[PDB]
Amino acid sequence: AQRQFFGLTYNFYGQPAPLFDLNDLQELAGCYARPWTSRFSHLAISTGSLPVWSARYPSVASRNIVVNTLLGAHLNPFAGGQITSHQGITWRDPVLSSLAPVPAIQPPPVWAVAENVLLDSNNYPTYVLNLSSMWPINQDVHIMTMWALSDQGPIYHLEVPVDPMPAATTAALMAYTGVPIAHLAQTAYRFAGQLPQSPDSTMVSTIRWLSAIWFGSLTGRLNRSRTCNGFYFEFAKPALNPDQAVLKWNDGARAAPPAAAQSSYIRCISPHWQHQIVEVAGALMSQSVTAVTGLPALIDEATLPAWSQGVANLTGNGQGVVPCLDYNPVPMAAARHLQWRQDGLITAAQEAQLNNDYTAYALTIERHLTAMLVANPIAAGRMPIQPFNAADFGQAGQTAAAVALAQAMFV
Amino acid sequence: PTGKLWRPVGTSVATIDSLAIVSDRFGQYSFVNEGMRETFSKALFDINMWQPLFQATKTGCGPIVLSSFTTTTSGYVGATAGDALDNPVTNGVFISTVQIMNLQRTIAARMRDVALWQKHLDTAMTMLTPDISAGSASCNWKSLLAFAKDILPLDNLCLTYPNEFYNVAIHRYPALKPGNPDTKLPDAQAHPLGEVAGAFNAATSEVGSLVGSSSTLSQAISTMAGKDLDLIEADTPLPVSVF
Amino acid sequence: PTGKLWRPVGTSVATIDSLAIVSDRFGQYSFVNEGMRETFSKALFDINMWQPLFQATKTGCGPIVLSSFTTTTSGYVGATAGDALDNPVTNGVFISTVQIMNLQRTIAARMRDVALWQKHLDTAMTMLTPDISAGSASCNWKSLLAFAKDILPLDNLCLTYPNEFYNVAIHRYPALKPGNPDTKLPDAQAHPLGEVAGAFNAATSEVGSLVGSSSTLSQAISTMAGKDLDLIEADTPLPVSVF
Amino acid sequence: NAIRSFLTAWDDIRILSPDSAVANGPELIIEDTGLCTSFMLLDNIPSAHLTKELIGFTWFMQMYQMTPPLPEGAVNRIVCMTNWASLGDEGRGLEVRLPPPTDSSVHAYKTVLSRGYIDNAQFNPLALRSNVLLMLLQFTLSNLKINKSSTFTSDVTTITSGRMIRAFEGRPELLALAYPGRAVLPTQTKNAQFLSTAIADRIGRLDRANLIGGEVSAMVECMELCDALTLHIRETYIMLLRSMHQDPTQIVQIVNECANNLLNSTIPISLRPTILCPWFASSEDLRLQQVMHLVNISSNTAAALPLVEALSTLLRSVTPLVLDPTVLTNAITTISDYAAFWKCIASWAYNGLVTTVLSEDAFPDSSQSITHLPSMWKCLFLTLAGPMTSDPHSPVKVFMALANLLAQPEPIAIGVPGMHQTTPASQFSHPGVWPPGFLNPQLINPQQAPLLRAFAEHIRANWPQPSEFGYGSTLQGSANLFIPSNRMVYPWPNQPLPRLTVAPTYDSAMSNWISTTIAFFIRVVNSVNMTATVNDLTRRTMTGVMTAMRQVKTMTPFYIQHMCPTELSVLASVTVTPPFQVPFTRLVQNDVITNVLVARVDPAQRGDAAVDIRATHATFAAALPVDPAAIVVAMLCGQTETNLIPSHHYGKAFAPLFASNAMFTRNQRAVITREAFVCARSAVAQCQDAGFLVPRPLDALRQFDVTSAAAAEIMHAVNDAFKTAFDLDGALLDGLALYGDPRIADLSAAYLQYGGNVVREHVPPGPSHIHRALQQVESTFMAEMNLFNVARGNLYLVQTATNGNWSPMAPVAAPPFVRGGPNVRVVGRFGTIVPRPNGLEPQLIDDGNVPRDIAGDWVYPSDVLQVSVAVFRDYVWPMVKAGRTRVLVELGHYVYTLHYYDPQISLDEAPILEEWLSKINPAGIPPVPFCIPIPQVYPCITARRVHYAFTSENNNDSLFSTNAASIDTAFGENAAVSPLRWPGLVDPNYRVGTNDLPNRITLYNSLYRYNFTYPTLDGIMYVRSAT
Amino acid sequence: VPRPNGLEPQLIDDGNVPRDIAGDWVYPSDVLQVSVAVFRDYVWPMVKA
């Protein structure tokens, strides 16, 4: 299958120890203190449209943002070989399941707190000699890596071949029809995180084809009148829950396979991704693919945070790197509505209408995060919000280039 | 459309100020309107022609397709945000600055390459006026060849590659008609790459020469408007500059 | 694309060798790129104009549509197998050699035909300067006509076909505005076939004349690059040839 | 059942889910874990008992014999048989079982027009395309099932060891068939040789674990054998389902909105890798379902009435309003059940399918005076109740009633030609007939006709102003035609339920109407004219009573303007049949919908103009008579229950409604009507030569032009097939095949407004998954008809006495003689033999019309042969048995039936043939009878036998293989196992999921075994709470 | 609204954004009337604690 994941631990943002305390270990949903196979656990049972977030976890990406620093704080293996222990907490045994208090009689060595520790994976020989059991850990660490190599939104990866969708892909995809993007992220992740799959498996090339097929919809290029291969995502009114996507199937005028491969990493600069279940789902839904199949190439050092500068085997700067086109939710959806008007889906009156109904919605996202960062600073201890600063929220980077990527990805 | 391509910049709806020249690591994509492709194609076309001489002499590097310097971006393409807003082009064909550099220095480097050979081919071609302007007139090929085998000075390049120059030549002189391989006879018609242009320059017996009579007119029209021949006997003060 | 059209002689798979100029009983189809249709259309357009004089005098043979010399083949069209491989054109419009011959000798034969009449129309037209360059100025039509009824020498062709030349004329001189049949009055606007061209030559009072000032510049630009005025006081050995 | 219970939070009581039938749901989920095939390899001629040689494998001592994966024996064909390896719970009673080519496959080709005259032993060649379309439509429907993934078991059988095959508990016999190549005994025999080249890898399942919920995988990738055609049909139905899948989570919002927040719930739903809730139908579809009910109801008012009472119940059984005249009676009495009413509000919800007019009895005979008291009262009741109806012509009929009564005191001229002030009010029921005086009060004079200029003045400025309101959820799908999406149109102006007070309860639209009218009539019963017959005392007693009514404290006017909209808005969402509703119009004349009609094709392209029967009825919708006298009472006495928190009340009521998943039955019956339509319209549009654009893969099959009457049967066969497959209730699609042209193009409903304007809602059915598959199937039927016994090409009848080799099917020798060839004469119509007097021999009548003689060779278009078999069998047939003549009957296709014999038993074929000629007649031909020799394994001296038939095309494609049990074959037409059928199992360049479909039905494919769970919501439901 | 794998049942607060029971609530009496069945089953066990 695959066994060689190069990771990278979360940044401290200038804080002493990793941003999380003792209580985070016995609060995680699902399997006790087991951080593995968590993420989409608090969403296992849907009650309604309202995004699941409590007091300690003020947002959607709050559950994951916490399991990240909690994850890295206990990742001496792959980066040292030992098991160590942070604040009296360690793994049960070599398989690395749930975290229990440091066992007596033979306690592990105390972990040396460090920021951004490069994970080699092969450094821990027990991993490959017990792959079929500790496989989820590979998918999860990969997630933490994509989240760590960015101070503003998880950097996933789109692709799309030069030729049309395989004959085994079109038959597998016709099963995730009436399924929201929020759920596609849950089924995608829970798939690549329980049993060692192959890089050329049917469910892998289809889930990847489902992610890049989602980006076009998010940009508006793959609407109701322009399918990639009969699949798209119908968006509801932004004032009436814009989180709803669903992979609808039609028989309209399909697009056409591009002249070349459109491999490209994408990011969401705007801190809006934090509270948007749709953005967090789109990110983690793509990460499920780069898990079973390590990074197709290296990531561009063009922008990114000041700590992801020249990583071991993650972010480069030469010619073997792939540019990262980052966008912004508000301008992206503002350009997404503009696509619908061009082909005649919406009236020229609903053009400037959907913009005001969405910008008001995205405002609620901004009014929420700003009010949560102040409530939960950073020097306090944890980092459920991630210090984004209020100077941003609307400084859209090359979002205009991400849109031009979708037009090129589906000619 | 024309000019550099722009794309929406920053938060907001597309608008006259949302736009910004889509520049980047390659320079700025400038749109390649229909006619401007005619030139770069007409320029590259005149180079590809010399294909048989590029391989023979191991220079060159394969045929130059203009589709190797362009791209298929899409956005609004104008001269300024304001006016670029009225030219939404989808998957247009733009050439990035750094590319507008190669298509330039390539056509320049190759242009030297051929300009040289093309000069040898000539001292040998015109060295037997392959151009008449009334009726026809042949000259049994054997003789012709066995003749230039002489005249041509020892430092040409038509003696080092005869049928490596000949193949280039056949496409420039509808006088030399190569003998077809599977009937071992000429063709009546001559098919030089300049098929049309060469057809429209022949001194057509009905009227001198369209290419001539056409220009001698546009030429005169230029002057007539230019110097200011019009107004030649105008009765009123005129700045000497006007002369 | 440009050049002659090629097609996979080896069938299906078209590689840089399984191609071959698609020649045949008609000669070789050469592609008719967008701009090259502008010319042959602009040439035929100037002939169709003389339609009323072709029928009157039983010459001609109906209006010449450029769509009678072309075809709708499809294949790869380049200058050489190698580069033609990057121009897959479907149902492009090509003109076969033997056709590139007629569109030629037709435009030539017709060109004579009109060149003659067109000369008579003129000695009569310019024979009353139908062109001013500031404000307007009329000349009651009756007089005008009854006048040229005189001057014009007995061997013109504007006396044998008045309103057979007049109809040709109306399309060349936005001075002569024909009186509309169902209101029996002029039109204010004048609609000569050269609608745009004639609009862009008028001596616009803001700036002399775009057609003039434009050329007087491109003309100078030619020289500046040509002779080599640039480098005029260069301090270093220069072959006399450079002069 | 989407929803099962609903423990209401405030009440804590689990509401469990339950001429017009009760709409039940379509059986959308059937599934079988057995082999996904419908093309078995049934062997035909049994094997001549060879001596095994290599027996089963020998593990240690034991000797394991395994069942031969492929059919062995003489000749094994590919006999089509739907769900032959089906191992699931059930199957939609409807299949296709064709007997091996050795039997009369004729029966399966006798649906459409065959029934009745055709002998059970012959099919109708004329109605073949029509009968093959219906035959495949049953081969599709039959195969519309899901493939449960069963339980695998790691195979440890050497060559295939390591591969995870599938169990097959139902009947272990399958495990043999399922995976050909798994444990192949080296016994070199056609069969075994082939199965040997099988790729060990292809067998079993492909993918690894995958989305393992619990311990079972969400959807595996079995590899088992499964005819590409069947695998493709199901891969279509899986999509049909997913298509209409409904995100379970959104279900809370749908209920929250559809009920207007009055009722708010929560429904936990465990999201899983698999899950499937076929409860959602797009508005795109729901409209083809709407105009559909519009067709079944048709002019028939009796079928439309069931709909307005269905609502008249729900309405009343949920309203806070309780009507009771006690108060009214008291008030009036001093100085001296309401179906009508409820069948007037429920009447508006369908204003457009059934209007509510005023019973003619109400009107006071135009010849009666106004001095006549009983008459002027029958008039006052006809006004107070007017607006209460949904007749676009009430505002006039009302005004007119009074224009009648006082015809002498106020003799005003009526504009409408041919009509006079004394014309029975009822009579006015067309926007044209409207009096100009009424259209413009100004026309009447104040002193000329005081009362009228005052009465028209009244109506012009008092009749309630129509209005509207949204309703249902937005994530639902309009389902309504003329009025904007999920949003109704109400008669009176409505407003959000204001906190009860003295203000809203006297200011309602209706309060004004009830008021100003009584006010107006009080001045009428006090006219000077009244004196003539009205007493001074009784004239006062009249003012006494009419004032009691006016001042009576009725609380309905408030209900019908604040609380009644919130009911319909909701009630209009929990109904299996959404509200059809054409826009309301008060006095705007030219625009007041005159006619409403469904069109089975846009008038433009409609050959044979046929209006919608509805046109015949006066009013545009089924005119349901409502009595004014009743409605007025109801309107004048509606006190509500003392304690009344609108919040708690409406809450408790709409609770039981959302418990019955009747909202989802609507979405389901909908996505099936759109299937049964895109499939019906297609099948009838494929049998007519011209007509609606539908891919005709079966255009080659001979089929006469289907008339209007004929279609209705190809239509009943299609519509009736769907119902049987999805066991539905009531109409569905038969409305189309019961009148008008069954030949529908694209349905559209349009109403024309008197203002000479026709708004026309086109409703094109969005891509029918079922139909997309059917097309692919019809397309396959061409390249593979032999697998259905039908054969393409002409039948030659040249007598051949060879004792050598034969194969009527795919004959190697060159066609005896082409049709337009040298010397062949086409037999002219009728094919009439002309006896010739004297020595001369009988000669056949030529096509060129000039009689030629028989000896030679003719080309018989089957049409001719069928209208003179008697003459054929007695003149040309004998001339054929004797090697003198060679006929060439021409049948595009047909049902062949062959009989295998012993190449060693010399037997003439003539008898076995005439058995045939004998049954041919105009009404229909019996299966063509070929006689093929059973492939002999050992060189055997064959016996001379004379054959007569054989085709022009090669039709032995059906033949799967001969002598699988032998190292080869010595005599009969030998046929090795073709690798082509199994590109998946054999070829190394296969590509999971790759078909061939249009051209060649592959056997061993790569299906995708699913494992869906069907979440069944049952949540808590909290009301709103007083405040 | 209940929450999956061991998470506090959120009590839909006023603004209509489910909040959590362990805190300080203000129960508009009317609400408490059409809701006790719930109150007693999730917030009550909480107040006692």
Short mmCIF file of C-alpha atoms in Angstrom, two decimals, chain D residues 565-748:
data_model
loop_
_atom_site.label_atom_id
_atom_site.label_comp_id
_atom_site.label_asym_id
_atom_site.label_seq_id
_atom_site.Cartn_x
_atom_site.Cartn_y
_atom_site.Cartn_z
CA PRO D 565 -53.76 31.72 5.77
CA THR D 566 -51.46 30.06 8.29
CA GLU D 567 -53.51 26.87 7.98
CA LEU D 568 -53.63 26.60 4.20
CA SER D 569 -49.92 27.56 4.05
CA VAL D 570 -49.21 24.52 6.22
CA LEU D 571 -52.07 22.23 5.21
CA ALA D 572 -50.88 22.89 1.64
CA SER D 573 -47.62 21.11 2.38
CA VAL D 574 -48.77 17.98 4.24
CA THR D 575 -50.95 16.82 1.37
CA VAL D 576 -49.98 13.97 -1.00
CA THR D 577 -51.38 16.17 -3.77
CA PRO D 578 -50.12 19.80 -3.80
CA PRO D 579 -52.56 22.70 -4.49
CA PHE D 580 -53.20 23.57 -8.16
CA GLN D 581 -54.03 27.27 -8.18
CA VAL D 582 -54.64 29.77 -11.02
CA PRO D 583 -54.28 33.49 -10.05
CA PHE D 584 -57.25 35.38 -8.52
CA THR D 585 -58.66 38.55 -10.17
CA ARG D 586 -61.10 41.15 -8.87
CA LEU D 587 -62.85 43.09 -11.65
CA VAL D 588 -59.71 43.47 -13.80
CA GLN D 589 -61.89 41.91 -16.56
CA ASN D 590 -59.66 41.14 -19.57
CA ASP D 591 -57.26 38.84 -17.72
CA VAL D 592 -59.80 36.88 -15.66
CA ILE D 593 -58.94 33.30 -16.65
CA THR D 594 -61.67 32.07 -18.99
CA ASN D 595 -60.26 28.57 -19.63
CA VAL D 596 -57.65 26.31 -18.04
CA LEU D 597 -56.32 23.44 -20.15
CA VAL D 598 -53.69 20.72 -20.31
CA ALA D 599 -52.05 20.18 -23.68
CA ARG D 600 -50.45 16.88 -24.65
CA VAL D 601 -48.38 18.94 -27.10
CA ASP D 602 -47.91 22.66 -27.88
CA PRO D 603 -50.66 23.78 -30.30
CA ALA D 604 -48.01 24.74 -32.85
CA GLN D 605 -46.63 21.23 -33.42
CA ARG D 606 -50.02 19.64 -32.62
CA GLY D 607 -51.24 17.75 -35.69
CA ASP D 608 -54.96 16.98 -35.49
CA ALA D 609 -56.00 19.92 -33.31
CA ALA D 610 -57.59 18.47 -30.17
CA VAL D 611 -58.49 20.91 -27.39
CA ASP D 612 -58.50 19.82 -23.75
CA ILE D 613 -61.97 18.40 -22.96
CA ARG D 614 -62.12 20.90 -20.03
CA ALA D 615 -63.06 23.59 -22.52
CA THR D 616 -66.62 22.20 -22.65
CA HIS D 617 -67.50 23.28 -19.08
CA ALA D 618 -68.72 26.87 -18.65
CA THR D 619 -66.47 27.90 -15.76
CA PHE D 620 -62.79 26.93 -16.20
CA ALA D 621 -62.71 24.57 -13.19
CA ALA D 622 -65.17 21.87 -12.09
CA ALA D 623 -68.08 24.12 -11.05
CA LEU D 624 -68.90 22.97 -7.50
CA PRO D 625 -72.19 24.59 -6.35
CA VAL D 626 -71.97 26.26 -2.95
CA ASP D 627 -75.12 27.55 -1.26
CA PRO D 628 -74.93 31.24 -0.24
CA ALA D 629 -77.64 30.80 2.40
CA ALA D 630 -75.32 28.38 4.26
CA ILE D 631 -71.99 30.19 3.88
CA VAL D 632 -73.49 33.44 5.21
CA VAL D 633 -74.50 31.76 8.48
CA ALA D 634 -71.04 30.26 8.97
CA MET D 635 -69.55 33.67 8.17
CA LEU D 636 -71.82 35.37 10.69
CA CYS D 637 -70.98 33.30 13.77
CA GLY D 638 -67.48 32.04 14.40
CA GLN D 639 -66.52 32.43 18.05
CA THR D 640 -63.27 30.76 19.12
CA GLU D 641 -62.69 28.58 22.19
CA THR D 642 -62.39 30.81 25.29
CA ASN D 643 -58.78 29.96 26.22
CA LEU D 644 -56.79 30.12 23.00
CA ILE D 645 -53.04 30.42 22.62
CA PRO D 646 -52.73 30.28 18.80
CA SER D 647 -49.21 28.95 19.39
CA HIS D 648 -50.23 25.85 21.38
CA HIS D 649 -53.36 25.20 19.34
CA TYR D 650 -52.00 25.15 15.78
CA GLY D 651 -49.02 23.33 17.26
CA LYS D 652 -50.99 20.39 18.66
CA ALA D 653 -53.06 20.14 15.48
CA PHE D 654 -50.24 20.13 12.90
CA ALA D 655 -48.44 17.58 15.04
CA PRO D 656 -50.43 14.52 13.86
CA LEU D 657 -50.08 15.78 10.28
CA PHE D 658 -46.29 15.63 10.07
CA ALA D 659 -46.37 12.22 11.76
CA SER D 660 -47.90 10.69 8.63
CA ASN D 661 -45.07 10.78 6.10
CA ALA D 662 -47.58 11.82 3.43
CA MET D 663 -45.30 14.71 2.46
CA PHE D 664 -42.67 12.27 1.14
CA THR D 665 -45.16 9.97 -0.57
CA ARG D 666 -45.74 12.99 -2.80
CA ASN D 667 -42.05 13.28 -3.72
CA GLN D 668 -41.89 9.56 -4.39
CA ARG D 669 -45.02 9.02 -6.48
CA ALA D 670 -43.64 12.03 -8.33
CA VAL D 671 -40.21 10.70 -9.36
CA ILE D 672 -41.93 7.59 -10.66
CA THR D 673 -44.54 9.40 -12.73
CA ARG D 674 -41.65 11.26 -14.36
CA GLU D 675 -40.07 7.88 -15.10
CA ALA D 676 -43.28 6.33 -16.39
CA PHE D 677 -43.66 9.42 -18.58
CA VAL D 678 -40.22 9.91 -20.08
CA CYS D 679 -40.63 6.19 -20.82
CA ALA D 680 -44.24 6.19 -22.04
CA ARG D 681 -43.87 9.26 -24.25
CA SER D 682 -40.77 7.61 -25.70
CA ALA D 683 -42.31 4.20 -26.45
CA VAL D 684 -45.31 5.72 -28.20
CA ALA D 685 -43.10 8.30 -29.93
CA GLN D 686 -40.95 5.46 -31.28
CA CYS D 687 -43.78 3.49 -32.85
CA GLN D 688 -45.20 6.36 -34.89
CA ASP D 689 -43.00 7.36 -37.86
CA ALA D 690 -43.12 11.09 -37.15
CA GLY D 691 -43.55 12.46 -33.63
CA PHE D 692 -41.54 13.71 -30.63
CA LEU D 693 -37.72 13.43 -30.86
CA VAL D 694 -36.64 10.22 -29.10
CA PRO D 695 -33.58 8.15 -30.13
CA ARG D 696 -34.93 5.29 -32.27
CA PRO D 697 -32.47 2.39 -31.82
CA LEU D 698 -35.28 0.11 -32.97
CA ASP D 699 -36.21 1.83 -36.21
CA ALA D 700 -35.23 -1.21 -38.30
CA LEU D 701 -37.88 -3.50 -36.75
CA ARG D 702 -41.01 -3.51 -38.97
CA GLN D 703 -43.88 -1.60 -37.33
CA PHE D 704 -46.89 -0.04 -39.07
CA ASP D 705 -47.73 3.59 -38.25
CA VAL D 706 -49.41 3.71 -34.85
CA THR D 707 -52.66 5.67 -35.04
CA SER D 708 -54.12 7.58 -32.11
CA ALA D 709 -56.18 4.56 -31.04
CA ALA D 710 -53.30 2.10 -31.43
CA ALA D 711 -50.98 4.20 -29.26
CA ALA D 712 -53.37 4.04 -26.31
CA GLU D 713 -52.50 0.35 -26.16
CA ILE D 714 -48.73 0.70 -26.47
CA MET D 715 -49.50 3.25 -23.76
CA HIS D 716 -51.52 0.95 -21.50
CA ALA D 717 -48.84 -1.67 -21.85
CA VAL D 718 -46.15 0.78 -20.69
CA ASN D 719 -48.19 2.49 -17.97
CA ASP D 720 -49.57 -0.83 -16.72
CA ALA D 721 -46.05 -2.29 -16.64
CA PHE D 722 -44.73 0.48 -14.39
CA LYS D 723 -47.55 0.11 -11.89
CA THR D 724 -46.89 -3.64 -11.64
CA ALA D 725 -43.18 -3.00 -11.14
CA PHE D 726 -43.64 -0.33 -8.45
CA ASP D 727 -47.11 -1.45 -7.22
CA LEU D 728 -48.82 1.97 -7.25
CA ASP D 729 -52.27 3.30 -6.33
CA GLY D 730 -54.64 5.09 -8.67
CA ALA D 731 -54.23 6.62 -12.11
CA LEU D 732 -50.49 7.36 -12.33
CA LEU D 733 -50.08 7.59 -16.09
CA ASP D 734 -53.19 5.94 -17.56
CA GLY D 735 -54.84 9.35 -17.71
CA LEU D 736 -52.86 9.81 -20.93
CA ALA D 737 -54.19 6.59 -22.48
CA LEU D 738 -57.89 6.99 -21.78
CA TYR D 739 -58.84 9.84 -24.13
CA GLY D 740 -57.22 12.41 -26.39
CA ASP D 741 -54.00 11.40 -28.13
CA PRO D 742 -51.84 8.91 -26.17
CA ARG D 743 -49.18 10.26 -28.51
CA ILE D 744 -47.86 12.93 -26.17
CA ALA D 745 -44.89 15.14 -26.96
CA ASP D 746 -44.34 17.54 -24.07
CA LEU D 747 -47.02 18.25 -21.47
CA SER D 748 -48.01 21.82 -20.67
#
